[PDB]
Structure 1
Amino acid sequence: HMCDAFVGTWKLVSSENFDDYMKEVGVGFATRKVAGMAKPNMIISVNGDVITIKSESTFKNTEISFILGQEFDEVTADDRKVKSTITLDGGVLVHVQKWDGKSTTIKRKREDDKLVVECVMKGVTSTRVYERA
């Protein structure tokens, strides 16, 4: 029952500073522009200890499956090859991605009926708000 309140199908309803976040991460112009138009569907499910997060969009579909606290390979939607670890900290899913000596942290939180995603790369934060589909 660890992630019960995250489970479901979620649709993006607002974005702030995502282009700047993607710039800070190193995403190039064309990918930023196309990816920035997308309104992804995030689908979160749990089977035993395995959490799966899918994101479906016109641009790219991604899927990760993981166990909390256990590092894994992830190829991001912008084609970074990263090492990821996702933990639960006080009810927040905290996802750290490491690549090329860099790091970014993505936090996913339930707040009212929303799922709020905060992405941080050095001093840049972007907020992506999802509601139930």
Structure 2
Amino acid sequence: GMSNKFLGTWKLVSSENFDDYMKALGVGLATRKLGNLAKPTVIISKKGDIITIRTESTFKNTEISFKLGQEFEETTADNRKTKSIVTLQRGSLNQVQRWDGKETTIKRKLVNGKMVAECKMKGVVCTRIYEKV
């Protein structure tokens, strides 16, 4: 299952190309401006086989709970209603969100003890690096 090294609290320390990623998602300017300033914490926890990913920031909080391989309904931080799934691949915790004929992926992987989230929509790739705190 998911590595226990994911469990805990993570703080954003770097974000590359997030504005264009939000644009690709259809997020408007005022929201993007606040999204570009946000430096969330992400809390990953488990209970049994249910994993929870909670994001906290001044602007927006989100939370998803899921079992690996089992599709679920999600509310995103930009207020999309998606059909989502999280699965593993080579230890990477990989999320797909689908809505309205569109798709985005968020792949969260451990790299030298940092959590790296790669976020792809259309051609746009955004990389967000988190430190464990």
What is the TM-score when the length of structure 2 is the normalising length?
0.97
Deviation of the 1:10 alpha carbon: 0.3
Percent of residue pairs bearing the same amino acid type:
66
- 1:8 aligns with 8
Could you tell me which runs of 5 or more consecutive residues in structure 1 were left unpaired when the two chains were aligned. none
Deviations 1:7-55 (A, max 9, x none): 1100000000000000011111111111111000000001110000000
Deviations 1:53-78 (A, max 9, x none): 00000001111000001011111000
Deviation of the 1:117 alpha carbon: 0.3
Q: Do 1:115 and 1:131's aligned partners in 2 also have CA atoms closer than 8 Å? A: yes
- 2:63 aligns with 63
Number of aligned pairs? 133
Deviating above 6 A after TM superposition, structure 1's stretches of 4 or more consecutive aligned residues are: none
- 1:28 aligns with 28
Could you tell me which runs of 5 or more consecutive residues in structure 2 were left unpaired when the two chains were aligned. none
- 1:37 aligns with 37
- 2:85 aligns with 85
- 2:118 aligns with 118
Superposition CA RMSD, Å: 0.8
